[PDB]
Design a protein around this ligand. Sequence first.
Ligand code: IRD
Length: 293
Amino acid sequence: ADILPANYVVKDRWKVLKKIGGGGFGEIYEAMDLLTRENVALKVESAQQPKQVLKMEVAVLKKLQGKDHVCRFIGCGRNEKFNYVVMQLQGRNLADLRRSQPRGTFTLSTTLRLGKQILESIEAIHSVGFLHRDIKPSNFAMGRLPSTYRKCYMLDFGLARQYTNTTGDVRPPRNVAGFRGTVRYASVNAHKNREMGRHDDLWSLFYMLVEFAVGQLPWRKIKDKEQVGMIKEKYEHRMLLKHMPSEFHLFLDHIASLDYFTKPDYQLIMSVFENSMKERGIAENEAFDWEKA
Ligand SMILES: CC[C@](C)(O)C#Cc1ccc2[nH]c3c(c2c1)-c1nc(N)ncc1CCC3
């Protein structure tokens, strides 16, 4: 039932090596580029799938070309069996890297520097008029080259939504929008099946950085969406910051002030990370936790 078999060649150029990811809505393969001789990510969608999502993912990827923390676009195409996108292959995701740490925690140095890169990638996708809507550690992957191995990349626009109309205006929110993303990092707004905004992506970032620094979130043992939302709705969020830099209160208060319509203050959040690093003498040039150094 895999869409492409091993050694299958796409457009006489991209040869399937193995499947590296799968879901309801498509599959991702590591392929060899028979022209350039590097390996690539080959993402495919069945031609016969009711929800045709990959054309939107490619439109977003193309709008982001030239930004940092974005996979290079290599090509795309469509035939009678599948649609496909070829993109730059990335490496280890942050969820696997965090689980590989002794106590499931990153240092504050690693946490804050990742936070700056993730924030940049979130502002970038927002700047081209899209919400990610499933910001989570497994959707960020470190690079796999000398030129990229300390760079963090945003993956999987499969749940993204355009929040502007054709002429650049904010579009009306639906009175109910079914939240179909991952439970652990979902905002209270997403839990309430409210239309998601730019602020909800920054809620996911907030929850991610607490889990990175502390090793856990209070609801991590609860998989049920409704239960987790009821736990978050009451949870005293300042408690999440007991063992975090005090600047994080400025981040919490700012995102708690936002609504669907309000452009976030990305700079205020960036300065929380930069001030937290400067207070603690954390340098940009520092080793990440997973490096020998
Ligand atoms: C960002 C643009 C797009 C087309 O929406 C996507 C994706 C995607 C969705 C699910 C995925 N799942 C995976 C990857 C991956 C990528 C992946 N991908 C790339 N480029 N290296 C490495 C990996 C890691 C292997 C798993």
